Recover the amino acids of this structure.
């Protein structure tokens, strides 16, 4: 693509630089370029990929929620008619967001997922697939909302099934996947109970496996366990 | 106060 | 241009939305679109324009300094040869930065400046012209460095001359222009003394005129006076 | 500690 002429290692090197420079769009473009080299991603590389896009889409999502909240406010009784602009700009942001999601989903589908045979890669990618469908779900309001949601669900579930089978309960990816899946339950699938049960169970099973971990791995897991806890605290 | 995801 | 089909007021409305959404690139694109409507900018609009681009270029500048510092580090004795990537990516960021600067300079030149007859608009625009040439100067290393610097200087000077003639010492634009011009002296023109004298004199003359201000105007001026003070404190 | 500009 755009990055077809750059060396894979250069793209990775530049993804790391863009990250240091907080240039996440660049980062994501370099990583997409790297993915498009056709070689599987190492752990660090998938991490770069995830981070790049998570940041990109995280900015679009945040912007989308700003605009969406503005838009809903302009749809309140007594709100002055402001014209199409808010909806238009929300749509513009939303379209670009969806385009990022589609891009990521497209990378996962061509061909990260099919080539991801280790649980750590496969679960990582499915988690990401769940995430990006969830971000699509966040803005989805049409007749595909259900399908988008269940694509998120299905990718999360497959990732949960493998991670449960193949990863220790404390695995950061397992924990992160559960955290997100639980958030999906909570705010996408309108299943706060499942969200809470998932976050609780995940947290508790991680707790019980902390003992097997070195100090470095301990610190990785508890970091995500804390996010589970933050959500449990928020939600209960 | 925003739920966490990772 | 890109925004040729949108209503000027819609572009402004969307610039404000993008600002709320911290979508500064969008903001800047909407404002450029608004500028390109050919009508002069109101005060609020010039403020939107300045803010949009200041933010855009502020992110590129920050990224550029990250990459530049990386690059200089990779040029230290004993630094492992990492390939062209750091320089390339710095160049890429730098090019994009220069393109923003050029874009802004281009808007100022077509045709904000020539149509800006009130001191507040004219000084504002010249300040911006000084700023964008200064941002060019920041990355300039070639044979145009001097010309870029003196274009910054010249735009700042003209803005200082008008502002001095036509604006109260406490005018936020006057103060902001002095602040930036003093930073130009300090770090672009290698004239720390002039930078300090300018910041001091500006601060002191603003101080002596605070009394004429309402509480709202007082608060605007002192805010920038504080930035002058911060620089004086840093530099002395 | 970075000089200010506005
Ligand atoms: C597909 O979904 C990916 C999520 C699921 C949970 C989390 C994943 C994300 C990243 C790559 C990592 C985590 C944390 C917990 C370190 C961050 C959380 C959000 O993004 C990163 C993964 O961690 C890795 O990447 C980090 C990069 O950033 C630094 C800080 C340099 O530190 C690095 C860590 O040492 C490394 O273990 C963490 O193992 C897993 C993969
Ligand atoms: C061409 O260079 C422009 C600088 C020179 C000094 C500063 C200018 C910038 C803006 C528009 C304004 C200032 C501050 C001091 C308020 C910010 C500083 C950097 O960008 C903005 C101008 O202020 C205006 O815009 C603000 C927008 O943001 C809010 C916070 C809503 O508050 C608004 C203020 O009430 C309004 O007075 C300030 O008057 C002048 C024009
Ligand atoms: Cl729009
Ligand atoms: Cl590059
Ligand atoms: Mg793309
Ligand atoms: Mg494989
Ligand atoms: Mg295993
Ligand atoms: Mg442009
Ligand atoms: Mg005029
Ligand atoms: Mg006057």
């Amino acid at each position: 693509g755009a990055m077809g002429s750059m060396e894979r290692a250069s793209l990775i090197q530049k993804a790391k630089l863009a990250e240091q420079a907080e240039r996440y769009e660049d980062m994501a473009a370099f990583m997409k370029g790297a993915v498009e080299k056709g070689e599987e991603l190492s752990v660090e590389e998938r991490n770069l990929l995830s981070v790049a896009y998570k940041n990109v889409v995280g900015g679009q999502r945040a912007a989308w929620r700003v605009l969406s909240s503005i838009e809903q406010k302009s749809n309140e009784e007594g709100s002055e008619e402001k014209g199409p602009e808010v909806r238009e700009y929300r749509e513009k942001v939303e379209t670009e967001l969806q385009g990022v999601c589609d891009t990521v989903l497209g990378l996962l589908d061509s061909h990260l997922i099919k080539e991801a045979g280790d649980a750590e890669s496969r679960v990582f990618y499915l988690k990401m697939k769940g995430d990006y469908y969830r971000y699509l779900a966040e803005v989805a309001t049409g007749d595909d909302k259900k399908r988008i949601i269940d694509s998120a669900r299905s990718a999360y579930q497959e990732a949960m099934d493998i991670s449960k089978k193949e990863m220790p309960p404390t695995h950061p990816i397992r924990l992160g996947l559960a955290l997100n899946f639980s958030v999906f339950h909570y705010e996408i699938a309108n299943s706060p109970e499942e969200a809470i049960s998932l976050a609780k169970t995940t947290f508790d099973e991680a707790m019980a496996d902390l003992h097997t971990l070195s100090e470095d791995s301990y610190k990785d897991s508890t970091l995500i366990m804390q996010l589970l806890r933050d959500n449990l605290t928020l939600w209960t | 106060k925003r739920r966490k995801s990772v």
User: Anything to note?
Assistant: Residues C 47, 50-51, 54, 124, 127-128, 172-173, 176, 220, 223-224; D 6 surround Fusicoccin A-THF (ligand 2) (CB under 6 Å). Chains D and A do not touch (no CB pair under 8 Å). DSSP finds no helices and no strands in chain D.
